[PDB]
């Protein structure tokens, strides 16, 4: 497992998000493990 993904995923898990089905894992992967870029996409639901 990539430690840069584990760190970003754990930071976002503490924010209250889930990883049901791996949606948050896939999001951080498409956003280069950028939490700010991931949070911007989440806002644009």
């Amino acid at each position, epitope marked *: 497992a990539d430690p840069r993904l584990i760190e970003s995923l754990s*930071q976002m898990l*503490s*924010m*209250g998000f889930s990883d049901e089905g791996g949606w948050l894992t896939r999001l951080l992967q498409t956003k280069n493990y950028d*939490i*700010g*870029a991931a*949070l*911007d996409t*989440i*806002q644009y639901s």
Partner: nanobody
Amino acid sequence: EVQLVESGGGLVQPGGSLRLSCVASGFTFSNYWMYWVRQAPGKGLEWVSTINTGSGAAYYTSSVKGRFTISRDNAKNTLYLQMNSLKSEDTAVYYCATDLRGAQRGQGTQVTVSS
């Protein structure tokens, strides 16, 4: 129970600098993901920055990264947002919130950028 009081907004020139404060009470502020959100003219609430008051991890939206700086004073129960090189698009009512969408926010402070 939960109370959030913002302050520090005002009218500034393009490129000016401001610092917003937000006094929090009624919950565990010293270990919490605190947010700054803003409502642009005629727009909806959008997140600006977030920080975990326990660890210190800070994250910003793409349009403000490098220009804004979020911080906190756990001993003062205060959340800060240092704003530099302000643009016209930064004009908004700024709130501190306990969530990304700004559901539990304060009354907010006004930041207007005009030359």
